[PDB]
């Protein structure tokens, strides 16, 4: 009842670059795609105390992870609420990973064949092949993600640090420079993100609260400064639009000054109102 209805990615503890991937009834292991092919909704049944693992496939919407008894094979099939479609999510504490056991037959658990790139059922052992990382899909897509960030008022412009020594942050036309790219990293303890500018090694986007609403890049060797961390909240029904609020004061949102689009326009924080000048597209640099 804390994972219920959550949308997640599932990857292998044995090979963290491999994710559960679904298409047309087949489940395989595949590199990160950051899309619905690797997304799953966990659906809790309180009576069984077990979960269905439903594919977020956009064409077939009723597909769930299914053990093909009596074989050891796994597939996705139409949800009929069968026992071979339910799974126990057992968290290995201290290892931050899950064993996923069949509810139908808990002697058997999911096993990742990293060489065949698929899944089967197996009895238990102490290897990482039966351990899985289950992560909120936003965190999974954004963590360690190198991106450009644009106001939705002008998707041709981006948020940039001015240059290696001018740590100011403004809006400018996209020119593929490293000062215009940010690597997002998630902090598990803080449950919040930092934006590292790629022109510097340890420079993060920061609310300079001792100076009103100013934001600038500053060194991340300021250990316990919440002003350096942000919540990234998806905007409904979009794939790449977010609001970005500050961990120090979550009423404070990343804000394009006045909603102006001119080169050099200030990026700041401002009281959250959720207008279009506080919405951002986070995208792959082309």
């Amino acid at each position: 009842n804390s994972l219920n209805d959550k949308i997640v990615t599932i990857s292998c503890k044995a090979d963290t670059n491999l994710f559960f991937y679904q298409v047309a009834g087949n489940v395989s292991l595949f590199q990160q795609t950051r899309n619905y092919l690797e997304r799953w909704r966990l659906i809790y049944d309180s009576n069984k105390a077990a979960y269905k693992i439903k594919s977020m496939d956009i064409h077939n919407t009723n597909l769930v992870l299914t053990w093909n008894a009596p074989t050891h094979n796994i597939s996705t099939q139409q949800d009929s609420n069968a026992d071979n479609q339910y799974w126990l999510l057992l968290k290995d504490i201290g290892n931050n990973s899950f064993i996923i056991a069949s509810y139908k037959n808990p002697n058997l658990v999911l096993y990742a064949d990293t060489v065949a790139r698929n899944l089967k059922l197996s009895t238990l052992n102490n290897s990482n092949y039966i351990k899985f990382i289950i992560e909120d899909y936003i965190i999974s897509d954004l963590n360690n993600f190198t991106c450009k960030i644009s106001p939705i008022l002008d998707l041709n412009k981006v948020v940039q640090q001015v240059d290696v020594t001018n740590l100011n942050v403004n809006l400018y036309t996209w020119d593929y420079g490293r000062n215009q790219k940010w690597t997002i990293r998630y902090n598990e303890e803080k449950a919040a993100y930092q934006f590292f500018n790629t022109i510097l090694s340890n420079g993060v986007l920061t609310w300079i609260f001792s100076n009103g609403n100013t934001v600038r890049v500053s060194s991340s060797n300021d250990q316990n400064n919440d002003a350096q961390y942000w919540l990234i909240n998806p905007v409904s029904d979009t794939d790449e639009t977010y609001t970005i609020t500050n961990l120090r004061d979550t009423t404070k949102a990343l804000d394009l000054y006045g909603g102006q689009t001119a080169n050099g326009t200030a990026i700041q924080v401002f009281n959250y109102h959720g207008d279009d000048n506080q919405k951002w597209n986070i995208r792959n640099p082309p």
């Binding site: 009596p70 074989t71 002697n107 009895t123």
Partner: protein
């Protein structure tokens, strides 16, 4: 008279992980131990024509048969339908031992857990079987 691929009589039972460890009871479990040259490592295999399976009793305890309990362990118990074993011969005297009965609507087999091929102090379990390639489910029956 012989009815099958495996003749009636006394066997030692070994795992493929070790030529020097022999199946014997220890308390109420079954495990593979050092050669004792004693009857408790001797197993009487008898074919049952009616069910085309085998029952396997311990020579030191002739009225006790290899069976399985409700906790996943192979046990030594009085005669019952849990004492019927269906071997699949996969090499010269190497067998997978299935329970005659479907368990949880699957084939279940003898299974010994190994740590880097070491099975010392491991109890023999009954676990699901899917094919003939699981090393933890392969056992030697040596006439002796």
């Amino acid at each position: 008279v012989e009815r099958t691929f495996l003749p009636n009589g006394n066997y030692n039972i070994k795992s493929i992980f070790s030529g020097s460890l022999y199946l014997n009871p220890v308390s109420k479990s079954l495990t593979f131990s050092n050669e004792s040259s004693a009857n408790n490592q001797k197993w009487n295999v008898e074919y049952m024509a009616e069910n085309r399976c085998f029952k396997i009793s311990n020579v030191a305890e002739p009225n006790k048969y290899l069976s399985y309990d409700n906790f996943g362990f192979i046990s030594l118990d009085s005669l019952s339908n849990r004492c019927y074993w269906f071997p699949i011969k996969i090499a010269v005297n190497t067998y997978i031992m299935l329970s005659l009965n479907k368990v949880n609507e699957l084939d279940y087999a003898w299974d010994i857990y190994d740590t880097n091929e070491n099975i010392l102090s491991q109890p023999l379990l009954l676990l699901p079987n899917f094919d003939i390639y699981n090393s933890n489910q392969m056992f030697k029956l040596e006439k002796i």
